[PDB]
Amino acid sequence: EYDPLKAGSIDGTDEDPHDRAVWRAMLARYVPNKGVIGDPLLTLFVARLNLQTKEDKLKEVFSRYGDIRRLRLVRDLVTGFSKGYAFIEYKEERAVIKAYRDADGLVIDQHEIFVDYELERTLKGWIPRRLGGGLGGKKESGQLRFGGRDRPFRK
């Protein structure tokens, strides 16, 4: 249950955006693009990949959890630069949960990858980081978004 309000706070107690990016998160409305395909339940969103990682290698290392119906690594539309994150569509929910629990931290091309579900069509009110918000973040970069798997709430 995404709430851009409490997402900027460690324990869900903030009633006023401490960052304009939070303020942008509340105002902006988000809908998944036409490139968002497949059943959202089986899309294992992975991030923090190496920009030199190819979509075949992702299929190669993520096939050990079972058969993979579809996969896409996201690259910049005009330039072609890899955006550093992909979307893995699996078959049978047994495979994706196995992908959930073990693949987080799995080193790929000298990077500790991040693994989560697809939270667009499942997490209510979800807002990506580009629209202000998202999850994770780094406290170094003047902002942070708690409530995710990386940074759960201090309840």
Next chain:
Amino acid sequence: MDVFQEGLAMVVQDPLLCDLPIQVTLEEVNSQIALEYGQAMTVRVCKMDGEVMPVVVVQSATVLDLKKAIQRYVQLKQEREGGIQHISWSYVWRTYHLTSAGEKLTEDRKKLRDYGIRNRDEVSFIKK
């Protein structure tokens, strides 16, 4: 009320005309006119996934003119394959640079010949 489309389609089948991408339009054919006259030059751009797009400009084309040619090429590409059409070119040119032989094409006013770019060359992208 589009009888011209049929004529353009069969005419493209000319073996000395297969280079043309179905819909011809004036700027594309006119650019290839200067190719025969030698005034134009092709500057290849490769996306980071390896796909290459042969952008064509004039010899005296400036860097900023080259930028619009990429916009003209990409935008023309999108309608034919039906991809994303409303490309935020303000953002794309805000974050990415143009580089050739390790030198970033920063001066939009400068012309490609001084930047060392010749015909059938290659330039790539890099972030700010």
Next chain:
Amino acid sequence: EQELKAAADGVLSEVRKKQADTKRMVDILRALEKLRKLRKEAAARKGVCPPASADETFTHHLQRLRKLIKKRSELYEAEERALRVMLEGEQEEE
């Protein structure tokens, strides 16, 4: 005059939009015909493959196409003349 112009603008500009489109196929065949010419200069070595069949197939295309384009433009010019006839007819008597 402002609404006199806009009334003329509403009809005359729309006809031109199609007429400019109607003209748009003419310079397409003009530029394409030119492009065909300079590639035959480079076809002095490429003329080994039969250009006569290629040239014959090319020429009969546009001429019928350009004839149909002229026929369509005659329809549009007539309406353009008719709109110019009617629109200026109303403005004097008002």
Next chain:
RNA sequence: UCUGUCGUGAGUGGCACACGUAGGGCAAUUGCUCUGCGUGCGGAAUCGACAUCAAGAGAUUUCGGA
């Protein structure tokens, strides 16, 4: 507190608008007029720009005008 309108693969698109910027013509060292580009109020410092959602790096403080 810092433009409008139409748009949803588009908080990021189109057009207009405002401001700034580059090139052209005209008049009396300056002024008037057209086309391209940048931002939607405009600057500075600092932290980032190698951040979790199918494409988008911003943010904290500060101070100038209306």
